[PDB]
Amino acid sequence: APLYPVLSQASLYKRHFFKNIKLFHVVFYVGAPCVTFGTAAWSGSNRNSREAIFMVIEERHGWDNFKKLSSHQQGVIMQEAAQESLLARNKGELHLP
Amino acid sequence: EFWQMYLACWPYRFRNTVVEWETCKAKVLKGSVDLQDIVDLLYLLAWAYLFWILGE
Amino acid sequence: PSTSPADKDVPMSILHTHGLSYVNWCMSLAPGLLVFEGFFRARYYRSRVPPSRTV
Amino acid sequence: RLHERRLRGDVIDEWEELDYHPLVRDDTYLAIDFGDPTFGRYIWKLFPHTDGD
Amino acid sequence: VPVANFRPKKPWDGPWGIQISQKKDRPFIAMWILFPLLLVDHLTREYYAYWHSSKVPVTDVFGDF
Amino acid sequence: AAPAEKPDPALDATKALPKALEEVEFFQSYAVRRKTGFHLFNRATGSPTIVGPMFYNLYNFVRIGRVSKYVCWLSLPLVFQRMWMKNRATGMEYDIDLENYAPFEAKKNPMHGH
Amino acid sequence: MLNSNIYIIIYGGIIMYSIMIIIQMFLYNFSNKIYIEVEINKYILSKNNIDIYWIICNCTIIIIITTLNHIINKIGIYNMIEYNICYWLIGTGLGLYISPFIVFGYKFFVYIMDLNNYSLNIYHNNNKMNDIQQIYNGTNYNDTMIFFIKDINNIFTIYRSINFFMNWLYQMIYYGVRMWLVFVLHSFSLGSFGELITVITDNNLIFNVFYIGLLGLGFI
Amino acid sequence: SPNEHLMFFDFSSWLLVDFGKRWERWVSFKKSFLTTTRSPYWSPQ
Amino acid sequence: PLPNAVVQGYTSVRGPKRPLDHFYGRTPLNIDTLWHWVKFPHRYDNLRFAVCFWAFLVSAHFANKKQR
Amino acid sequence: VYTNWQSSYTRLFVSKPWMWHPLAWMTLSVGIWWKFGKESLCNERSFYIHTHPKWAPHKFHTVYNWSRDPIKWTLAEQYASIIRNTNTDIEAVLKIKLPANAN
Amino acid sequence: VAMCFSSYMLAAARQPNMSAKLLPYCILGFALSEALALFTLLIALLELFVFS
Amino acid sequence: VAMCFSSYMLAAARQPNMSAKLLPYCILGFALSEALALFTLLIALLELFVFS
Amino acid sequence: DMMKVMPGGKAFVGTALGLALFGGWGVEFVKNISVMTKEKPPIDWNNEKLGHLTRS
Amino acid sequence: LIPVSLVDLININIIFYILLLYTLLLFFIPLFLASINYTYHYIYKYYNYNYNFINNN
Numbered sequence A: 001a002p003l004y005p006v007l008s009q010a011s012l013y014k015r016h017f018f019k020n021i022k023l024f025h026v027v028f029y030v031g032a033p034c035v036t037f038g039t040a041a042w043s044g045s046n047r048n049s050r051e052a053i054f055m056v057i058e059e060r061h062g063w064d065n066f067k068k069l070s071s072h073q074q075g076v077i078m079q080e081a082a083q084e085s086l087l088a089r090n091k092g093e094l095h096l097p
Numbered sequence B: 001e002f003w004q005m006y007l008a009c010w011p012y013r014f015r016n017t018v019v020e021w022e023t024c025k026a027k028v029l030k031g032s033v034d035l036q037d038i039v040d041l042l043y044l045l046a047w048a049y050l051f052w053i054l055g056e
Numbered sequence C: 001p002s003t004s005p006a007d008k009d010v011p012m013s014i015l016h017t018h019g020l021s022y023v024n025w026c027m028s029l030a031p032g033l034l035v036f037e038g039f040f041r042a043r044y045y046r047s048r049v050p051p052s053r054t055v
Numbered sequence D: 001r002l003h004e005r006r007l008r009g010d011v012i013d014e015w016e017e018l019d020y021h022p023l024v025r026d027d028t029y030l031a032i033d034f035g036d037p038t039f040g041r042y043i044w045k046l047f048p049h050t051d052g053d
Numbered sequence E: 001v002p003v004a005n006f007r008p009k010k011p012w013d014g015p016w017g018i019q020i021s022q023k024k025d026r027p028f029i030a031m032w033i034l035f036p037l038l039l040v041d042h043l044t045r046e047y048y049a050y051w052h053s054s055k056v057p058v059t060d061v062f063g064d065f
Numbered sequence F: 001a002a003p004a005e006k007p008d009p010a011l012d013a014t015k016a017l018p019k020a021l022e023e024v025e026f027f028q029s030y031a032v033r034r035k036t037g038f039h040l041f042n043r044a045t046g047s048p049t050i051v052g053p054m055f056y057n058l059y060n061f062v063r064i065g066r067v068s069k070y071v072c073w074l075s076l077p078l079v080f081q082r083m084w085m086k087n088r089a090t091g092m093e094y095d096i097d098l099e100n101y102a103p104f105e106a107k108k109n110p111m112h113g114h
Numbered sequence G: 001m002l003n004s005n006i007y008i009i010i011y012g013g014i015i016m017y018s019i020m021i022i023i024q025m026f027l028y029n030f031s032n033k034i035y036i037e038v039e040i041n042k043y044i045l046s047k048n049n050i051d052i053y054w055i056i057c058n059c060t061i062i063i064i065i066t067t068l069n070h071i072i073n074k075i076g077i078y079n080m081i082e083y084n085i086c087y088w089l090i091g092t093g094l095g096l097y098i099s100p101f102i103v104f105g106y107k108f109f110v111y112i113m114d115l116n117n118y119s120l121n122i123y124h125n126n127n128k129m130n131d132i133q134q135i136y137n138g139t140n141y142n143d144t145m146i147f148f149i150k151d152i153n154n155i156f157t158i159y160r161s162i163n164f165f166m167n168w169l170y171q172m173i174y175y176g177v178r179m180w181l182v183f184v185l186h187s188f189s190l191g192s193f194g195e196l197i198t199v200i201t202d203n204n205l206i207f208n209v210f211y212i213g214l215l216g217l218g219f220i
Numbered sequence H: 001s002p003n004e005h006l007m008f009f010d011f012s013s014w015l016l017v018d019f020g021k022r023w024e025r026w027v028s029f030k031k032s033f034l035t036t037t038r039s040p041y042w043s044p045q
Numbered sequence I: 001p002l003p004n005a006v007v008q009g010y011t012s013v014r015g016p017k018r019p020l021d022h023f024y025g026r027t028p029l030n031i032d033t034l035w036h037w038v039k040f041p042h043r044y045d046n047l048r049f050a051v052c053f054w055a056f057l058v059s060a061h062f063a064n065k066k067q068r
Numbered sequence J: 001v002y003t004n005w006q007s008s009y010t011r012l013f014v015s016k017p018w019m020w021h022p023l024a025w026m027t028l029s030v031g032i033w034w035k036f037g038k039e040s041l042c043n044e045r046s047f048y049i050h051t052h053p054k055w056a057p058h059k060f061h062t063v064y065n066w067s068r069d070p071i072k073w074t075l076a077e078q079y080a081s082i083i084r085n086t087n088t089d090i091e092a093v094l095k096i097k098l099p100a101n102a103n
Numbered sequence K, L: 001v002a003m004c005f006s007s008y009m010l011a012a013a014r015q016p017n018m019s020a021k022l023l024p025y026c027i028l029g030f031a032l033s034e035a036l037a038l039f040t041l042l043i044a045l046l047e048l049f050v051f052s
Numbered sequence M: 001d002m003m004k005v006m007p008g009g010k011a012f013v014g015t016a017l018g019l020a021l022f023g024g025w026g027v028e029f030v031k032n033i034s035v036m037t038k039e040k041p042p043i044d045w046n047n048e049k050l051g052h053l054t055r056s
Numbered sequence N: 001l002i003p004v005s006l007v008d009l010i011n012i013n014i015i016f017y018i019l020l021l022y023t024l025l026l027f028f029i030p031l032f033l034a035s036i037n038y039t040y041h042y043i044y045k046y047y048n049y050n051y052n053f054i055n056n057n
């Protein structure tokens, strides 16, 4: 005659899935997508290339004219700016200050 | 060996396109759609969105 | 007051990414995760031996 | 009475199982309230035959 | 006659052990909801300033402006 | 003042290095490989390389992984993207007027500040 | 308007990045507890051991967690947080600095306020004139016409009381700055070497190959 | 870039707070609380 | 480098660890036991081929019409 | 059996100095910011130092764009909103002639 | 820096059993001796990438 | 750099059986001593090919 | 001086009293040691003319 | 370099980081204390009072 709110076997079976995690089971399984689509590899490259691209654009052509042009010519000019930044002809081809 | 099997598998695929389509229609109307079916349909929609971008 | 300018809204595409070098990818420590996930999984699931019969 | 359920194959929670040991449950809860999870020299003093074991 | 040093439970005896387990495993449950939310918060994010930006996102906390 | 404490064996250090060698031996045990399908390019002298014979261990652990072996490779196309874009940029033709007016990260540009 | 004094606060990604640091503490479950127990029982014996022990455990495990997220979970703040001086001075050093003052603050405060009544410490103080000098004159030393200069005396005696609590602050600051410099300079140097090597290989595409190996170099 | 890895550009916005207005509203709230409670001068409040 | 207490995980006494529950009569449910319920997609692969073709084609049609 | 662990966070906090440590940490950090970083960095009179290349290198991911001046135009928009909410006259300030503390 | 590890080597060659108790003092001897080199390296890097 | 290999030499010359357990320390010390020279080299190469 | 060494927090009381009374002037003195040798301008003494205004 | 900056010494963003971290730590302390030791089980099992009786004869 248990006087407490007995918890079902299936409820325990489900809670065991949540509390039987290990440290590596969190670290690696969540770090692989994070490291791949994070500030190191993909998102970082994207979001830090954008800064140089739009700096070059606003210096050479202008942001208003760039917005007025078409998406295709916009992407072309962005690609040229990306090439100029990746090249870094003024830094001796080195991404350092 | 793969080339021969790749060719020979084309009739199976073209035959089972309609079969899989009919079962998917039956599963949606009947509502008898399960987790594995949902996962396969999500994979399908991901690939379809990719090829939509590619077609654009 | 609160604002949401259009300057932050810019075009995005993976084609415009400069990318990474081989050295930067090696320094990204993804290959270490690649190895050590399997290492720690193996250690954990190999510490617990089951019963057996010696033949 | 608790071990009967374990023999049927039912999984018992650690704290549900501790509730069926009420006198140890109380002292264990007070050790948690104090916040000292260390142990062993208390055993080696109350039972000196265990010292070094 | 009953056995000594025994009594019925009272409100100040605190929750049961199963209830303490249900309290413990709530962070472990919210983990599954928050780590994907962390990854989505990082992936669906946009920078706030650029070389061309004439404005910067402002957030009036108390509506004083 | 004069407590006369006996030596405690738990404070000694006679298990850390043995345990580390046990972990390393468990690591190297997964480097055991069969003779069939074995090939390793030696150096020009004929002596083995360093990194060469310790790739099978790493990839045998990659075999045992579950998610990283299907995710961590998606950052590798980005390397070839850079390899291609760099070569495009090494010889890109540009306007002289725009290069003289807006050089990228050049020094002594008053529009930047210095 | 005149009364409006406006202040700008720079706010970024804090909430979701700080939640997972505490949520990971259930997974780590204080693995450093045994080491810190050993060290605390080596260095001190009192009833208030558990307090300082728990404090150090929290600080150290937070350091470890942040370091591992800085090595593995590379997003946003987790990369900068170990390369930043504010974290190394206030998020690790300040807690360890104030921990003994929070555990044994009563005794240290009483000690300091007794050292403001500066006096010479005698071992086996069976002297009577020492007591009369300490009560009547306040100190063993000659306090004649120091009230003439009391204004400086107060603060100087205060420093004289905390001089033996000041090297702790100095060592904390020194080792925090050391860790910051170590992380920053080693990361910068390694990245610089990487960039120079990539420049050499991009200018010589016969070498722009995975020359050590895809996993070998990364694992090393 | 290495400095790009030693950089934190994960900001979201700028929270602007008129501390003068906030101090004024704090004082007004204190006055309103003391008037509603009708508290005397000798109160700890 | 580190003491034996830190290596073995205890200063004086090794504490007993409660073993893992098994739930007799059913499969284990862990983060690593999920392929038992969710295999790789295998049911709608041919439909995937067909739908990818149709998606590409319809997208190309509407894109060309928009551009023209 | 009664426990502050499950029935009173206040008495739990009071009975454990190692719970007071984070609160004192928070208070000290906020006091440090209030004393040093508030007026020197966050105030509008002291916010332009974030454009400095020596004391705030690449706070905007680049060198600061002075031709654009986002700080200037943001704050000008905010002051304009303040002026419109208060219905203050712009040109009333120009009619003032302050005296000098002669002698 | 290398003096420390040379000392640890020869000390363990005199007594292998003590190699575990001296190894803390070996690591302790490295990071400190290495630190000053880093501080010497700081100024030269503080000298260029901030000053014009 | 050579002080580490010299130390390993004399250590094995006093105890050959311990040669296997000290070789990891030997490689570790060579790299650390070599790294400081390598760090010093970065300034010299950074001083020329970028600065005008 | 003889109340400082008394028990009952009288050391803290004496030290804090010495601070509140004389140590503030001592802090000001220490700040002014590197001010005495420095060139300072003449004091712009207030003309005590600005501020008067009839009541209404 | 970027981290060599007086702005990054009293960074309010990191101060908010620390604030949120230790508020959550304070909230979750009573769950960190919920680990069980088996010392009172031992004391119950092994504590045996003297059960012999007195017999003058």
Ligand SMILES: CCCCCCCCCCCCO[C@@H]1O[C@H](CO)[C@@H](O[C@H]2O[C@H](CO)[C@@H](O)[C@H](O)[C@H]2O)[C@H](O)[C@H]1O
Residues within 6 Å of the ligand: A040, A041, C023, C024, C025, C027, C028, C029, G070, G071, G186, G187, G188, G190, G191, G194, H001, H002, H005, L031, L032, L035
């Ligand atoms: C026993 C060895 C003795 C020799 C010691 C050699 C010094 C080793 C220093 C190790 C510490 C360096 O710290 C490490 O720096 C690298 C390089 O930026 C960072 O790496 C990060 O920045 C680089 C720089 O481009 C990116 O390419 C990369 O994708 C990213 O992960 C790591 O995230 C950080 O963990």
Ligand SMILES: CCCCCCCCCCCCO[C@@H]1O[C@H](CO)[C@@H](O[C@H]2O[C@H](CO)[C@@H](O)[C@H](O)[C@H]2O)[C@H](O)[C@H]1O
Residues within 6 Å of the ligand: G029, G030, G031, I001, I002, I006, I007, I008, I009, K027
């Ligand atoms: C080597 C040069 C000198 C530096 C020496 C110090 C290096 C320290 C860094 C390595 C730290 C490894 O930290 C390691 O953490 C794990 C947790 O996973 C601890 O693990 C410990 O606790 C767990 C549970 O909490 C027990 O089950 C286990 O039996 C026990 O080993 C290890 O005892 C500790 O050694």
Ligand SMILES: COCCOCCOCCOc1ccc(C(C)(C)CC(C)(C)C)cc1
Residues within 6 Å of the ligand: A022, A023, A024, A027, C036, C040, C044, G027, G028, G031, G068
């Ligand atoms: C030289 O070592 C390099 C490997 O370092 C990898 C860093 O990994 C981060 C933490 O990884 C883990 C994960 C789990 C664990 C265990 C399994 C021991 C956790 C435990 C104690 C909870 C069982 C240990 C380390």
Ligand SMILES: COCCOCCOCCOc1ccc(C(C)(C)CC(C)(C)C)cc1
Residues within 6 Å of the ligand: F023, F024, F027, F028, F031, F053, F054, F057
């Ligand atoms: C958590 O820390 C443990 C990590 O330990 C990693 C040690 O790394 C070295 C392993 O790499 C090797 C080296 C050599 C070898 C084998 C090549 C021993 C030599 C052999 C197989 C020819 C005898 C295998 C793997």
Ligand SMILES: COCCOCCOCCOc1ccc(C(C)(C)CC(C)(C)C)cc1
Residues within 6 Å of the ligand: A010, I026, I029, I034, I037, I038
């Ligand atoms: C890729 O995977 C993402 C989603 O994963 C879902 C995994 O779901 C498996 C759920 O496990 C079960 C299975 C059966 C059951 C029941 C209650 C139906 C079993 C029963 C009736 C035998 C008690 C409960 C949980």
